[PDB]
Amino acid sequence: DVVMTQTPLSLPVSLGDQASISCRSSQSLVHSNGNTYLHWYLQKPGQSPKLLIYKVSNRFSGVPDRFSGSGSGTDFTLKISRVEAEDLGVYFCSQSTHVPWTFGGGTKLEIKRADAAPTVSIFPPSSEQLTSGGASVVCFLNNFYPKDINVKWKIDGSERQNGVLNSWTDQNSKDSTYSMSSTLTLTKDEYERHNSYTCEATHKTSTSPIVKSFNRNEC
């Protein structure tokens, strides 16, 4: 199997910036018929891979003039003249000169933007979940930046360390922020053994934590 190596793994850049992704093969990609079967793809969050550059340097139909492919032999590079927010996602190269066809491990393009604090919302269990005898406490931390954030749940001033599920979205294609969901799943017996439920976040945009809470009885 020919090995494809992609560098870097992550590439943060600002709108307008130029970006360079490199891809190397363990063996020559020049086919005995004389073509070099090296292609570049972009996979946007949630979508399937889309071809950008075919055979080292041919810009595919409908691809912006700001993407160019270059290289030969075993070193190829993909250049993006001026990064736009919609270029966000993972770029892959592949070789199809040899069977098996193989892909690089991908390079994630991240867009650097101005810090933005989390818009926090806390949600207590709906009557319907309580009837099934379940109590899930949901907290949304929407549109922040950078990705690095920390959430903690406090039940009656104490720190809960069991029953929390966290999920992060990929970076947004439109405004380049991140969101995150944090769910505290308790049985209803568990949920009525306490009163204060607190969603607490730590983002470098504020020195003090962003706190959102609600009390069961206070409800």
């Binding site: 066809w101 919302s121 009557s127 949901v138 949304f140 969901s181």
Partner: protein
């Protein structure tokens, strides 16, 4: 408009078989080599099989991982390719994409998730997420929808039959106790809610579930 429509994905017990299909339209099918590629968080993107066109006798190739277990075939009369998979293992799990490779370009289908597990199909439990005290965050309001304990993926979530697009966040599903749980938020202009009705619609093909929950105000 080209499209590669792949179908036949879903949940299947290890050791059992599965058959995927791909229908192509919008380009000259006989001028292309068809390939199935799969993607999984573990190994990332991996090529699995290929079937060439007429000029090359419909020759087929496979990766060592599936040789002997997978068979690929095509029918130029129906613009279709098929992937017959037998004795599936955990390592075969992933999103399978139908692809067509040609002289001037290449296209990829949308992908179909194949889940190889012994677990049984579990319908999701859908619950609305209304504010503790619905007023105004700024010029907006965040509402939600919890899709609890289902199996397997995927689950489709839309807001207002689809009419509400901007301001929607659907988080990746997370595996808890052998089950998936997922949420979706949507932010709407304050004057809009609770004035007009907002509802999440959830669809879980595997269990043939289709739920529509309206998001109502809740002081509690």
């Amino acid at each position: 408009e080209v499209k590669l429509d792949e179908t036949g994905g879903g949940l299947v017990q290890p050791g059992r078989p599965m058959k995927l299909s791909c229908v192509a339209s919008g380009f000259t099918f006989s001028d292309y080599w068809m390939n199935w590629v799969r993607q999984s968080p573990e190994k990332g993107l991996e090529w699995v099989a290929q079937i060439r066109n007429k000029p090359y006798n419909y020759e087929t190739y496979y990766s060592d991982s599936v040789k002997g277990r997978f068979t690929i075939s095509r029918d130029d009369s129906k613009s279709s390719v098929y992937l017959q998979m037998n004795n599936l293992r955990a390592e075969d799990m992933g999103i399978y994409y139908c692809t067509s490779y040609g002289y001037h370009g290449a296209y990829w289908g949308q992908g179909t998730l194949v889940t190889v597990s012994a677990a049984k199909t579990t319908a999701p439990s859908v619950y609305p997420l209304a504010p503790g005290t619905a007023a105004l965050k700024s010029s907006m309001v965040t509402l939600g929808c919890l899709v609890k304990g289902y199996f397997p993926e995927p689950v489709t979530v839309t807001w207002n039959s689809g009419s509400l697009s901007s301001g929607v966040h659907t988080f990746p599903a997370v595996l808890q106790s052998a089950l998936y749980t997922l949420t979706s938020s949507v932010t709407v202009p304050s004057s809009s809610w609770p004035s007009q009705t907002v509802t999440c619609n959830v669809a879980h093909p595997a269990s043939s579930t289709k739920v529509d929950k309206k998001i109502v105000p809740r002081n509690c």
